[PDB]
Symmetry: C3
């Protein structure tokens, strides 16, 4: 049994929008100290690790901890009805429905059918990342969107002064390059000197679309090793994607 209240349904819409891009269904582990989800796409290209601690929520109250599961696209449509300043209520009682409320000038209350919550354990390898950077979302979205014109793949490369995103096609190429001189780069740490991998443009663009240009995004990578893109949610939540490399 739970009742959780978040003060921005629209913020939450935007997390759900990123998830629906990769998964048809999500399992939410609802615990005393917060919400967690971990899932992988059927292509095994994309892994999400999501942690939403209770402190993020206006009211948070859970009795028995349990996993709920529901159709991402169904939930997303409800959330797309939220107006500015609507609050969000997620509520579960006795039956097997998630109750969803949108509270504004009117109060709108949906009930959505829950489904089989059988997530098998997902284990996260340790990963020898040699690069780590903090960049602005608008900068990445630039890079990524410039790659798409040229290719389905984007190269992430670093030296210790240099963060470069490049693509190459049959007859075109595109380098976007960031140093400590640019606003979009906040931080750049190399544990070495040569670092290069490729990831699927389509995948990254779907990850970065909800974020506002000004959101900080954390990046970690290496040679032919999964890419990390992590966003802090109100300085407490985490949202983490691992994206498998290419070639």
């Amino acid at each position: 049994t739970f009742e959780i209240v978040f003060d921005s349904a629209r913020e939450f819409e935007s997390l759900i929008a990123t998830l629906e891009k990769f998964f048809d269904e999500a399992v939410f582990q609802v615990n005393m100290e917060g919400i967690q989800m971990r899932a992988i796409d059927p292509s095994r290209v994309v892994l999400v690790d999501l942690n939403l601690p209770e402190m993020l929520f206006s009211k948070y109250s859970v009795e028995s901890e349990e996993a709920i599961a529901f159709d991402l696209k169904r939930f997303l449509k409800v959330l797309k009805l939220a107006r500015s300043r609507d609050t969000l209520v997620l509520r579960k009682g006795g039956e097997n429905f998630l109750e969803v409320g949108l509270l504004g000038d009117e109060n709108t209350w949906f009930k959505l059918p829950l489904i089989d919550a059988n997530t098998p354990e997902i284990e996260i390898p340790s990963l020898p990342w040699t690069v780590k950077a903090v960049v602005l979302a608008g900068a990445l979205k630039r890079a990524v969107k410039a790659a798409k014109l040229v290719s389905d793949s984007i190269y992430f490369m670093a030296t210790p002064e240099k963060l470069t995103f490049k693509a190459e096609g049959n007859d075109s190429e595109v380098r976007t390059v960031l140093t400590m001189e640019d606003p979009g780069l906040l931080d750049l740490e190399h544990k070495m000197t040569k670092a290069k991998s490729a990831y699927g443009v389509a995948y990254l663009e779907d990850i970065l679309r909800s974020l506002a240009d000004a959101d900080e995004v954390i990046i970690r990578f290496g040679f032919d090793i999964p890419l990390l893109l992590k966003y802090m949610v109100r300085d407490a939540g985490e949202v983490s994607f691992l994206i498998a490399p290419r070639v």
Copy 2:
């Protein structure tokens, strides 16, 4: 023969854009007293009644009382070009054409043909409404829009305390609740204490889309009777829909 002038071609557009979701052609009855329309849609769920008194027009000048009939979608496209402050002119002179003027920074005049002006006399049957309400459009549009997710029809329900719009459909339901403290509900009148009737989501959508969020809408419904959605035009006009229950 007439010449009629309205202050806001854009305002006029909103009305036409509604009529147009339900009809291909409109028959406007032009009288000394004003303009009138009343018809039922081909599908036969919706009745519209439209009174625009002389009062609303900056110039109203009828030389004789005419029925005139035109393609809605051709008229509407005309009005969609109206700019921010444009005046609208309607004029028939001695021929089968409606002179349409959009008067502003640019002056634009259309001649569009009249079609065969034939629509029957119709009686609006007084019917036993148990619930009345004045709500803001925005509120009803959200309600319908949230109902549409779950189902094809939406229930209008009232207690003396509240108006609720519900929908049950497949393995899902939704409820939208309004109380008197909310800005969306200005007035609730009841004769009976309970009220329940179902309607077409798709129709309601179409009636409501031209409305501003802040427009007052009067609703009258009851135990299994057509719904009356009404709104007033600059206070003196009236646009009314009767939607059949399901």
Copy 3:
């Protein structure tokens, strides 16, 4: 070897967007004095003339002169990535590719492949035009949109007093009138009393689209002749279009 640096990618985008509606490719003579392009469209009814003198650019280093050709949609799509905060760089080297620089918060550098510069020399004909006029794009946009609703053809007309944009056929007509009292008409020049030619509604639409309502357009027509449609670029360079009549 040339490095040209333009102030506003976004303005440059607007121009490109237009050309693209008409050519899939374009040749650009990069000269010591400016960039020029003359070219008739595959479908034969439109001629573009473009000339952008060195002074428009914030930098105009150009070691030696050459023509360069390229796909427009590819260029265009790049320029559409340009944000508010972006400055445009067009660089050429020994290699056979156009380098394209979006300089703003971050810097993006593209390499687009230069294609075959096979472009006929074209002589701009002498024209017995009778009326030139300066008008606001917005006004003409009205004109043209109003015309589309009635025909694939719009008549451009002039008296010493007014500009009329008229069209007909279906069973309807439409005129848009622009007098000197109207803000949309700045300037009216006459070698003769009147003018009248008819042009492709579609071709106009495509031209006017990247234009803002407040942009000044020079138009110049006569009796059954092409129309010159020409605007300025930072009041220095020009882009002009000739449109065969009907």
